[PDB]
Write a protein that binds this ligand. Sequence first.
Ligand SMILES: CC(=O)N[C@H]1[C@H](O[C@@H]2[C@@H](O)[C@H](O)O[C@H](CO)[C@@H]2O)O[C@H](CO)[C@@H](O[C@@H]2O[C@@H](C)[C@@H](O)[C@@H](O)[C@@H]2O)[C@@H]1O[C@@H]1O[C@H](CO)[C@H](O)[C@H](O)[C@H]1O[C@@H]1O[C@@H](C)[C@@H](O)[C@@H](O)[C@@H]1O
Length: 148
Amino acid sequence: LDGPYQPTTFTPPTDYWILINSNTNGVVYESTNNSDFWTAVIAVEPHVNPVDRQYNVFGENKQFNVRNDSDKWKFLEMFRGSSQNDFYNRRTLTSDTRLVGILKYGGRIWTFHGETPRATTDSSNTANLNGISITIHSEFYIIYINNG
Ligand SMILES: CC(=O)N[C@H]1[C@H](O[C@@H]2[C@@H](O)[C@H](O)O[C@H](CO)[C@@H]2O)O[C@H](CO)[C@@H](O[C@@H]2O[C@@H](C)[C@@H](O)[C@@H](O)[C@@H]2O)[C@@H]1O[C@@H]1O[C@H](CO)[C@H](O)[C@H](O)[C@H]1O[C@@H]1O[C@@H](C)[C@@H](O)[C@@H](O)[C@@H]1O
C-alpha cells in the first residue's frame, strides 16, 4: 500500500507491517534495541551449496554457514538475546515472492517463517519493543508474503 520507501534506518511505530522487497543475496535488515534483541535476516539465493559467507552485521564481521537446495529464496533469521550471546538461525522463511515482513505489536516482534504459500507468523518477546530500530537494505512498504 504505502511505498516503496528507499533503504534507511528508522524506529518503526507499533501496529504497522513493514514489507521488505528483498532484491539481493545479503543482509535484508538488521534490527536491535541494543539490550535484549538482535535480529538480522540474511537472503540466500536459490541453489547454493554450503558456503561460509562474511556479513557486516551491527558493525561486526560475522561468518554464517548458509545453503539452499531449493528453487526459492531462503531468508535466515539470525537472532541473539545479548551482545555476548552467539547468533543462531532462529527461523527460516522459504519464499518465491522475496517479501520479508516485520510487525511491532503487543510487546512482540512478529515475522513470517516456513515455506510460501503456507508461511505463518511467529513472535519474539522483548523487554524493550519501543527501543527496537531497523536498518532496511532494500525498498520497503508499510501496511502478500505468501502471494506477492
Ligand atoms: C511447529 C513449527 O511452527 N515449526 C517451525 C519451527 O519453529 C517453531 C517456531 O514457532 C518457534 O520459533 O520455535 C518453536 C519451538 O519452541 C517451533 O518449533 O521453525 C522452523 C524455522 O522456521 C520451521 O522450519 C522451517 O520451515 C519449514 C517449512 C522448512 O522449510 C524448514 O526447513 C524450515 O527450517 C518449523 O516448521 C516445520 O519444519 C518441519 C521440518 O523440519 C516441517 O517442514 C513442518 O512442516 C514445518 O511446520 C510448518 O511450517 C511452520 C513454519 C508452521 O507454518 C507450521 O504450522 C507448519 O506445520
